[PDB]
Design a binder for this molecule. Structure first.
Ligand SMILES: *[C@@H]1O[C@H](CO)[C@@H](O[C@@H]2O[C@H](CO)[C@@H](O[C@@H]3O[C@H](CO)[C@@H](O)[C@H](O[C@H]4O[C@H](CO)[C@@H](O)[C@H](O)[C@@H]4O[C@H]4O[C@H](CO)[C@@H](O)[C@H](O)[C@@H]4O)[C@@H]3O)[C@H](O)[C@H]2NC(C)=O)[C@H](O)[C@H]1NC(C)=O
Ligand SMILES: CC(=O)O[C@@]12CO[C@@H]1C[C@H](O)[C@@]1(C)C(=O)[C@H](O)C3=C(C)[C@@H](OC(=O)[C@H](O)[C@@H](NC(=O)c4ccccc4)c4ccccc4)C[C@@](O)([C@@H](OC(=O)c4ccccc4)[C@H]21)C3(C)C
Ligand SMILES: *[C@@H]1O[C@H](CO)[C@@H](O[C@@H]2O[C@H](CO)[C@@H](O[C@H]3O[C@H](CO)[C@@H](O)[C@H](O)[C@@H]3O)[C@H](O)[C@H]2NC(C)=O)[C@H](O)[C@H]1NC(C)=O
Ligand SMILES: *[C@@H]1O[C@H](CO)[C@@H](O[C@@H]2O[C@H](CO)[C@@H](O)[C@H](O)[C@H]2NC(C)=O)[C@H](O)[C@H]1NC(C)=O
Ligand SMILES: OC[C@H]1O[C@@H](O[C@@H]2[C@H](O)[C@@H](O)O[C@H](CO)[C@H]2O)[C@@H](O)[C@@H](O)[C@@H]1O
Ligand SMILES: *[C@@H]1O[C@H](CO)[C@@H](O)[C@H](O)[C@H]1NC(C)=O
Ligand SMILES: *[C@@H]1O[C@H](CO)[C@@H](O)[C@H](O)[C@H]1NC(C)=O
Ligand SMILES: *[C@@H]1O[C@H](CO)[C@@H](O)[C@H](O)[C@H]1NC(C)=O
Ligand SMILES: *[C@@H]1O[C@H](CO)[C@@H](O)[C@H](O)[C@H]1NC(C)=O
Ligand SMILES: *[C@@H]1O[C@H](CO)[C@@H](O)[C@H](O)[C@H]1NC(C)=O
Ligand SMILES: OC[C@H]1O[C@H](O)[C@@H](O)[C@@H](O)[C@@H]1O
Ligand SMILES: OC[C@H]1O[C@H](O)[C@@H](O)[C@@H](O)[C@@H]1O
Ligand SMILES: OC[C@H]1O[C@H](O)[C@@H](O)[C@@H](O)[C@@H]1O
Ligand SMILES: OC[C@H]1O[C@H](O)[C@@H](O)[C@@H](O)[C@@H]1O
Ligand SMILES: OC[C@H]1O[C@H](O)[C@@H](O)[C@@H](O)[C@@H]1O
Ligand SMILES: OC[C@H]1O[C@H](O)[C@@H](O)[C@@H](O)[C@@H]1O
Ligand SMILES: O=C[C@H](O)[C@@H](O)[C@H](O)CO
Lengths: 401, 355
């Protein structure tokens, strides 16, 4: 559960979250409730259910990295627990909205009087095939169209195996909040509702880039060919995800390492401490990785320096903050920046400050010599940037060894 | 034949009767027809105000598990369900709880409970679940207690359905929608019931209902010996109003009134729903009753008894000095009624655990 509550990521919030004590709650989407055939209906690999089946809350993906469930704690059941505590009413349409007789009529009638409308969306994928685009699973496009027609307070919650296309509605003023919650396992619903009701502020951030379009990603991501010897050439090199997005100058929807809270954090007092170094003595096994500065005592993974910064909860509510550190290694055709540290502060009171610390190892500031076939620390001007996301970096400094 | 015995207030309603008579005495013929016939509003039925004497519209509201078509309330178990408890305490508390929710939603008259019509001649009865037991004794007991619960909570009851209303098939309520009329198409099923059976089986629960102080009774859609229940003189004027000494009002089921004059003469006191439901369910009194009085066909005093029977409940349950709050929900539904709804939360601690 605590994993779910720490992961769930807030992408948009025009004022609707956290919920106070809404009296009339509307829920949309089979994602909000059980698989109609049972949590384990899809079998040993969570891939045997029909393509149109209502599989319910998307708690894991398809294939060999799935597992059986003792139960699922559905969002609806958890939302209901909370409604009942508030002496409120709650109603869910969980059928296929396109194919079920009266579904659309029901939604039209249910939503206008709701204080808030949740829409649960999912996007299953699996081992054995690739997603054909950023397409919402089942009836999700429809759900969303209906929802914004009849309600001005839609809160979208996505259970997905990756980025999905929400371009149609993400800038609709009627969509007041959007959250992704990934694949939260069995404690799906009870990990989420605390966040929505504001018992714990959301603290999770995107572990990849949310581009406005599949066309903004590394070309030829999937090659389709009947050719007896199929060929993908990684001609983009090191430039995947936000590295690609950064180098090409492409603004995504939501950047790598982005995710809102219910409060704001102000960054301050950047500090690089050259005296804060230490030898790697802890790791279980060692590589035979070659590097310039090697002298028979030392390591690629020695922490050469350490960098510090200060966050201040400048908001109105307690909240956790994932601080990120990026470095610009100099060189030719070198990423605009690369993440070389993160430190999550837990539950920072309003007005309070905490120090963020980042141990930079040697390898963290090195390049591969193609010619000499070793790791070496380049010369040049290293940019160090610290902040909230891969594009929210209010503190830079420069280092030159 | 069987004349209409005048109301006198009985045992418990003595002072309420006398306030009712007093008020009715002041009423014009228009006022009499205003209160004895349904008008348009948010509740299942609504009596016209007597606005010059400050009598307001009465909200009549379904139904026998609690106020229907409202938000902010609880869904109680059915009569069938309490019956199965065989627990008098639960039967009472159920009704008492239904009662506070009716009162607090703003209902003057609860179209409840179901007290032996249908009782259960057929196990296929579509609405048999609204009643209790398939047994006069047990149904009488539950009916007594169901009535007491609602009335103790400050809501007039309309026990239903009188009587011998034992199948839904071809009840054939009165409806004159489109061009077509049910009266042209097919008469209601006629329950034809000997006098022992009527006494020993069907009347038994209603006797209990009367004894508990049900303020009103709703006459059923079926006909009895080929006369409509709502204009059956033997059934309403003699069996109910004389032998069971019933002191309250007979409300038509919605389209259970088929005529103007026999109804006025043979026991009916309230025409429902009147102007409600686009007038589609019959509208036999109102302006028609005004005409019939003014031209000597129907005695004004006959209609004053009806209005007295209506006001008796008003005054007895203290709705005059302690009025229910405004009713806030459109329970009729668009496009039949195009009115916006408010919101009121009426759920109280204790109700969920009682259920
Ligand atoms: C539906 O139709 C059924 C079937 O016909 C109806 O059932 C009939 O109901 C009537 C009552 O309305 C009933 O009438 C009696 O028959 C008895 C003989 O079988 C008569 O003895 C009895 O008469 C006495 O009662 C009358 C009414 O008060 C008096 O006017 C009359 O003078 C008699 O009473 C005196 O004598 C007795 C002593 O003998 C004394 O105790 C009295 O106090 C008084 O001094 C009835 O007339 C029929 O018998 C019923 N038939 C059947 C088969 O049941 C039913 O009523 C209809 N239902 C509706 C809603 O209309
Ligand atoms: C083919 C394959 O991927 O097999 C394995 C078995 O170990 C492999 C690794 C894989 O992790 C594993 C266990 C999974 O967990 C997968 O999620 C998984 C799959 C990807 C799936 O694979 C497929 O559907 C195959 O492409 C499919 N293959 C073909 O039909 C085929 C024919 C000609 C050319 C190429 C392919 C197949 C379907 C059903 C039974 C056997 C083979 C089979 C499989 O049943 C599962 O396979 C079997 O259970 C199985 C395979 C062969 C014989 C008997 C049983 C699958 C599941 C559980 C559904
Ligand atoms: C509910 O879960 C189902 C898994 O148990 C899922 O069905 C599977 O969906 C995928 C698409 O994500 C299908 O993928 C394949 O489609 C055709 C197969 O002929 C190929 O062109 C593709 O390359 C791809 O491999 C699976 O076929 C399908 N599984 C079965 C047995 O039908 C449902 O889609 C899930 N429901 C929803 C609404 O998301
Ligand atoms: C006959 O009854 C109707 C139905 O209520 C009366 O009119 C309403 O009067 C109330 C006050 O009692 C007003 O608030 C409403 O505005 C009236 N409604 C309508 C539809 O106009 C009517 O007043 C009654 N007439 C008499 C003579 O008492
Ligand atoms: O609208 C009511 C449903 O009735 C279904 O049928 C009933 C039976 O034919 C039989 O018991 O008679 C009653 C009427 O006396 C019917 O209502 C059937 O007709 C469905 O179409 C209706 O949904
Ligand atoms: C937003 O919702 C309202 C109903 O609350 C609807 O009338 C309006 O069309 C919607 N607008 C957009 C931009 O979807
Ligand atoms: C991609 O691979 C094909 C297959 O050998 C090759 O012909 C083509 O030139 C390659 N292009 C690159 C590496 O950019
Ligand atoms: C009295 O009025 C009613 C209804 O308006 C009408 O049916 C009846 O025939 C009238 N009778 C007389 C004697 O005018
Ligand atoms: C006089 O009798 C006629 C029926 O013959 C009736 O219409 C009228 O109302 C009667 N008057 C009385 C007794 O009130
Ligand atoms: C209510 O509105 C509908 C559609 O707007 C209209 O057709 C209907 O006549 C109205 N109902 C009444 C009773 O006026
Ligand atoms: O980096 C040195 C050299 O290594 C090899 C090739 O990939 C060249 O493109 C590159 O410039
Ligand atoms: O590109 C130069 C590089 O390519 C080859 C390797 O085996 C290296 O020894 C050599 O230095
Ligand atoms: O062509 C020789 C080969 O080794 C040298 C490098 O600089 C590479 O650019 C190249 O792959
Ligand atoms: O730098 C040139 C490079 O050539 C090849 C190998 O022998 C490497 O060890 C050497 O470093
Ligand atoms: O072992 C390192 C390896 O690097 C590459 C070449 O430079 C070779 O000379 C050498 O074998
Ligand atoms: O509460 C009764 C209410 O109903 C009618 C309205 O016209 C108001 O004038 C009045 O106050
Ligand atoms: C409809 C039913 O016949 C009636 O019992 C209600 O009380 C009126 O809505």
């Amino acid at each position: 559960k605590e994993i779910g509550s720490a992961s769930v990521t807030l992408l948009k919030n025009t004022g609707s979250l956290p919920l106070k004590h809404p009296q009339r709650i509307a829920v949309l989407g089979n994602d909000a409730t059980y698989n109609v055939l049972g949590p384990n209906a899809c079998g040993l690999a969570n891939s045997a259910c029909d393509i149109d089946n209502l599989n319910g809350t998307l708690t894991t993906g398809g294939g060999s990295g799935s597992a059986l469930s003792p139960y699922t704690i559905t969002p609806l059941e958890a939302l209901q627990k909370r409604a009942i505590e508030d002496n409120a009413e709650i109603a869910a349409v969980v059928a296929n909205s396109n194919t079920t007789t009266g579904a659309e009529d029901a939604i039209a009638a249910l939503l206008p009087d709701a204080d808030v409308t949740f829409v649960f969306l999912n996007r299953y994928s699996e081992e054995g095939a690739d997603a054909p685009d950023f397409s919402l699973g089942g009836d999700g496009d429809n759900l969303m169209d209906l929802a914004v027609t009849y309600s001005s307070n839609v809160v979208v919650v996505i259970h997905t195996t990756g980025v999905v296309d929400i371009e149609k509605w993400a800038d609709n003023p009627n969509v007041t909040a959007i959250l992704v919650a990934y694949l939260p396992g069995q404690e799906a619903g009870n990990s989420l509702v605390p966040v929505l009701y504001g018992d714990v502020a959301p603290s999770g951030k995107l572990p990849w880039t949310w581009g406005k379009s599949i066309d903004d990603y590394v070309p030829n991501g999937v090659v389709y060919t009947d050719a007896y010897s199929p060929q993908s050439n990684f001609t983009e090199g090191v430039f995947i995800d936000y590295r690609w997005f950064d180098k090409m100058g492409i603004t995504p929807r939501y950047e790598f390492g982005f995710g809102l809270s219910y409060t704001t954090f102000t960054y301050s007092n950047l500090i690089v401490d050259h005296g804060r170094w230490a030898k790697d003595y802890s790791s279980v096994m060692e590589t035979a990785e070659p590097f310039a500065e090697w002298d028979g005592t030392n390591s690629l993974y020695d922490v050469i320096f350490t960098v510090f910064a200060t966050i201040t909860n400048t908001g109105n509510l307690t909240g956790s903050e994932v601080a990120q550190l990026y470095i610009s290694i100099p060189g030719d055709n070198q990423p605009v920046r690369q993440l070389r540290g993160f430190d999550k502060i837990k539950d920072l009171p309003v007005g309070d400050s905490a120090v963020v610390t980042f141990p930079i190892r040697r390898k963290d500031v090195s390049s591969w010599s193609v010619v000499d076939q070793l790791w070496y620390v380049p010369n040049g001007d290293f940019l160090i940037s610290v902040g909230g996301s891969s594009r929210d970096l209010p503190l830079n400094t420069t280092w030159t060894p | 034949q069987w004349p209409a015995p005048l109301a006198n207030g009985g045992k418990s309603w003595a002072s309420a009767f006398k306030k009712a008579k007093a008020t009715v005495t002041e009423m014009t013929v228009e006022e009499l027809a205003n209160i004895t016939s349904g008008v348009i509003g948010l509740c299942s039925g609504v009596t016209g105000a007597v606005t010059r004497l400050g009598i307001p519209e009465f909200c009549l509201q379904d139904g026998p598990i609690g106020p229907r078509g409202v938000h902010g309330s609880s869904q109680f178990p059915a009569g069938l369900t309490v019956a199965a408890t065989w627990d008098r305490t639960l039967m009472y508390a159920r009704a008492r709880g239904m009662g506070q929710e009716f009162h607090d939603q703003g209902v003057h008259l609860a179209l409840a409970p179901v007290t032996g019509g249908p009782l259960g001649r057929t196990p296929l009865n579509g609405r048999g679940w609204e009643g209790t037991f398939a047994d006069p004794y047990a149904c009488g007991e539950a009916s007594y207690l169901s009535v007491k619960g609602l009335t103790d909570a400050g809501v007039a009851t309309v026990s239903k359905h009188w009587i011998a209303y034992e199948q839904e098939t071809s009840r054939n309520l009165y409806i004159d929608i489109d061009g077509v009329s049910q009266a042209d198409i097919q008469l209601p099923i006629s329950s034809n019931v000997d006098d022992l059976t009527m006494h020993e089986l069907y009347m038994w629960s209603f006797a209990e209902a009367v004894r508990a102080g049900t303020n009103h009774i709703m006459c059923s859609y079926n006909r009895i010996n080929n006369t409509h229940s709502c204009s059956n003189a033997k059934g309403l004027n003699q069996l109910l109003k004389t032998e069971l000494n019933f002191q309250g009002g007979v409300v038509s089921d919605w389209g259970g009134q088929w005529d103007s004059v026999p109804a006025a003469e043979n026991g009916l006191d309230v025409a429902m729903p009147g102007k409600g439901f686009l007038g589609a369910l019959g509208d036999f009194w109102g302006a028609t009753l005004v005409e019939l009085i003014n031209n000597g066909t129907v005695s004004e005093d006959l209609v004053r008894d009806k209005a007295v029977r209506i006001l008796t409940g008003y005054y007895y349950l203290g709705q005059d000095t302690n009025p229910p709050p405004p009713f806030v929900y459109n329970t009729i539904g668009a496009p039949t009624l195009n009115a916006t709804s408010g919101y009121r939360n009426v759920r109280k601690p204790g109700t969920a655990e009682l259920i």
